[PDB]
Design a protein around this ligand. Structure first.
Ligand SMILES: CC(C)(COP(=O)(O)OP(=O)(O)OC[C@H]1O[C@@H](n2cnc3c(N)ncnc32)[C@H](O)[C@@H]1OP(=O)(O)O)[C@@H](O)C(=O)NCCC(=O)NCCS
Ligand SMILES: [Br-]
Length: 190
């Protein structure tokens, strides 16, 4: 069963996919809604992002999370949170950001670029492989306004590489020495 919290997630996140940045801005509601204080709502969001980061860390066999509320506030990352039993539940998230990279082309030459990067990506195990990952990824691409092949991927797992191959035909890679993966077509757009 997906991730449940001691507060009303549906009240907190009206949309199915919630977009948050360093501001950690609680989504607007409608007038009928009375609301808890903003500081409290932000704390709820901070807890959600902390727990998501930890769960993603467990899924990826990481000894420490790469996504946290604290990290979100001190960086320029964007998280897209997919939400799902009165309290509501969280299915998963994807986190992106622009990063400066020293990238190898097909001629083993290093190029300074700053592409959009897929930094963290997680769907709760109970409902993995149900198409939820694609749902998040499609929404992100649209909002971020980028093509799949324009992306750099930070340490992509075996699951993600299949995911990208199936859904976007990202198959051929240009080997890197950092732990980022780029795909054929990455440099044409550069
Ligand atoms: C990677 C992840 C976000 C994929 O999201 P998802 O909701 O499972 O993916 P979707 O259901 O939208 O797409 C299904 C496709 O993803 C890939 N995939 C998902 N789970 C897989 C598994 N257990 N084994 C192999 N491929 C898998 C496959 O290509 C699959 O297609 P298929 O089922 O027809 O073979 C999710 O599986 C996950 O959270 N994995 C663990 C954390 C992780 O690896 N994150 C990325 C690290 S950079
Ligand atoms: Br973060």
């Amino acid at each position: 069963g997906s991730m449940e919290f001691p507060f009303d997630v549906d009240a907190l996140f009206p949309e199915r996919i919630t977009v948050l940045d360093q501001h950690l801005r609680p989504p607007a509601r409608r007038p009928g809604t009375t609301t808890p204080a903003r500081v409290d709502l932000q704390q709820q969001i901070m807890t959600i992002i902390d727990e998501l980061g930890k769960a993603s860390a467990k899924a990826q066999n990481l000894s420490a999370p790469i996504t946290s509320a604290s990290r979100m506030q001190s960086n320029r990352h964007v998280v897209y949170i997919l939400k799902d039993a009165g309290k509501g539940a969280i299915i998963g998230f994807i986190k992106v950001g622009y990063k400066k990279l020293f990238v190898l082309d097909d001629r083993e030459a290093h190029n300074e670029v700053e592409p959009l990067c897929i930094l963290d990506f997680y769907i709760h195990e109970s409902v993995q492989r149900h198409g939820h990952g694609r749902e998040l990824f499609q929404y992100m691409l649209q909002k971020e306004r980028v093509e799949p092949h324009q992306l750099a991927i930070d340490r992509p797992s075996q699951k993600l590489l299949k995911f990208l191959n199936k859904h976007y035909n990202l198959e051929t890679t240009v080997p890197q020495v950092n732990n980022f993966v780029i795909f054929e077509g990455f440099f044409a757009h550069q």
